[PDB]
């Protein structure tokens, strides 16, 4: 998973590196490059339209539309991340990045989807947004994932992008934050991953010009050292911390 630095269009070096990565990863890799590179019969991809909402549309319907747009961008399986995301940047820089993502319309992954969800829900002041990071373990390897937890009318859901359907979108129907996180943990266990750490952030400002930073790791929960009851207690403590601004 290389990261494209230098913006779009992809520079010659990053383009060649992406194609070399493809040639080594994919069997038929250089045949793949030979078929695709320079081809004149490739499909035209329509630029997906950014959803806009009537004031009468309920927020959960808007969330469905936003998740649909994010999915339409497609999950990035090319091995080259096309947008560099510096997580410590001020909000307004990340929002400019999300706007450029909407204008250039390329495949994305976990963190790009989180930033896009923040950018696309800034118009919903009754909706709170906060990042949720997962660190899991499988077959001697550690894995990291992130979604945008969401809160509306006292119920929790999520937006995001993931390889698996049960590791991204959750409609805002979970009555407590712990139930949402435990649903994610159940999906992880279903795909034979052990959940090690959960990192929950504070609410993100709805001001796209804000210079504040996203507070990614307001609560870092070691699942195994906490146990069930203390895990739930800490998740509810984070929920309280959030709803008290």
């Amino acid at each position: 998973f290389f990261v494209n630095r230098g913006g779009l269009p992809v520079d010659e070096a990053t383009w060649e590196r992406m194609w070399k990565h493809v040639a080594k990863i994919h069997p038929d890799g250089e045949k793949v490059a030979q078929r695709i590179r320079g081809a004149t019969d490739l499909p035209k991809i329509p630029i997906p339209s950014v959803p806009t909402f009537q004031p009468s549309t309920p927020v959960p319907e808007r969330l469905e539309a936003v998740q649909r747009y994010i999915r339409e961008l497609q999950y990035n399986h090319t091995g080259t991340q096309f947008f560099e995301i510096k997580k410590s940047r001020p909000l307004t820089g990340l929002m400019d990045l999300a706007k450029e993502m909407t204008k250039e319309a390329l495949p994305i992954k976990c963190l790009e989807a989180v930033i896009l969800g923040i950018y696309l829900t800034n118009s919903m002041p009754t909706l709170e947004r906060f990042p949720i990071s997962f660190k899991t373990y499988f077959s001697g390897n550690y894995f990291r994932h992130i979604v945008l937890g969401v809160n509306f009318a006292g119920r929790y859901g999520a937006l995001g992008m993931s390889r698996r359907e049960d590791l991204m979108y959750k409609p805002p129907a979970f009555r407590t934050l712990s139930e949402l996180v435990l649903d994610f943990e159940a999906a992880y266990g279903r795909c034979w991953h052990v959940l090690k750490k959960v990192k929950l952030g504070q609410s993100v400002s709805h001001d796209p010009h804000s210079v504040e930073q996203i507070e990614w790791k307001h609560s870092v929960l070691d699942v195994e050292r906490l146990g069930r009851d203390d895990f739930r207690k800490e998740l509810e403590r984070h929920a309280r911390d959030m709803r008290l601004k």
Binding site: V22, K44, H77, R163
Partner: peptide, 29 residues
């Protein structure tokens, strides 16, 4: 300017063809 738009269009089309190929590969193996 206008040539850079054609550049971005060609690159995006190739990126999505490649992404389809790699998505099929990954969903298999």
């Amino acid at each position: 300017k206008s040539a850079q738009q054609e550049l971005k269009q060609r690159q995006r089309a190739e990126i999505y063809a490649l992404n389809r190929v790699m998505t099929e590969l990954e969903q298999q193996q």
